[PDB]
């Protein structure tokens, strides 16, 4: 049904802002929730937050809320993540999927993930 693709991997400097975009193809973003999840290599999955497609409301992981912004771009059928003041603890593979929950099938599509390395 739905395919998701994260923007490309690369470096972010400590204290600066990590920015990622997820482009949805073969489907619209006019339903469901749209989510970011990260995985520090070797370790587990951490949910970052979600944006609800129909009304645009956001919910964030409490441990990240102060630094995270999610948004939806209807004109490109994309949604995005902004993560401020990164440190090396934010190095991870970032996935973009329909997490949280949907009104008919969510988290059934997981972006292949993109590696963000926080480095000087």
């Amino acid at each position: 049904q739905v395919q998701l693709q994260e923007s490309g991997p690369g470096l972010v400097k400590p204290s600066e802002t990590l920015s990622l975009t997820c482009t949805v193809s073969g489907g619209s973003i006019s339903g469901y929730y749209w989510n970011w999840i990260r995985q520090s290599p070797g370790k587990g999955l951490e949910w970052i937050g979600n944006m609800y497609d129909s009304t645009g409301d956001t919910n964030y992981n409490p441990s990240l809320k102060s630094r995270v912004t999610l948004s939806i771009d209807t004109s490109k059928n994309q949604f995005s993540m902004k993560l401020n003041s990164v440190t090396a603890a934010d190095t991870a593979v970032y996935f973009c999927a329909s997490g949280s929950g949907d009104w008919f099938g969510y988290f059934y599509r997981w972006g292949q993930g993109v590696l963000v390395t926080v480095s000087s």
């Binding site: 999955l45 951490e46 949280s100 972006g111 292949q112 993930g113």
Partner: protein, 107 residues
């Protein structure tokens, strides 16, 4: 948040073995629990949704059960392509959370 406790964290098994992975939620989540499979260098893959529904394209050797706070993922007879990390996840009570993962390695 709802804390998901997966058990065991690590498991050693052989092709043909019956494998059981358990997931405990810090509060009741009714039947709203999903199971994912993840291989190194790859994205997770949905196996089971809403505690017992097998996702299409997933082999029937995978089955899920449980309700409330206790859940089980069973792999009836482990296949070579089944060696991976498995995660439970609940979409319930602010917010949605994953278990720590179960790594299934070759004995």
């Amino acid at each position: 948040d709802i804390q998901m406790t997966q058990s065991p964290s690590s498991l050693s098994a052989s092709v043909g073995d019956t494998v059981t992975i358990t997931c405990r939620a810090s509060q009741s989540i009714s039947s709203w629990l999903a199971w994912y499979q993840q291989k190194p260098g790859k994205a997770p893959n949905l196996l089971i949704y809403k505690a017992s529904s097998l996702q299409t394209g997933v082999p029937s050797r995978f089955s899920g059960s449980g309700s409330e706070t206790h859940f089980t993922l069973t792999i009836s007879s482990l296949q070579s392509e089944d060696f991976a990390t498995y995660y439970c996840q609940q979409y319930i009570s602010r917010p949605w959370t994953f278990g720590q993962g179960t790594k299934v390695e070759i004995k």
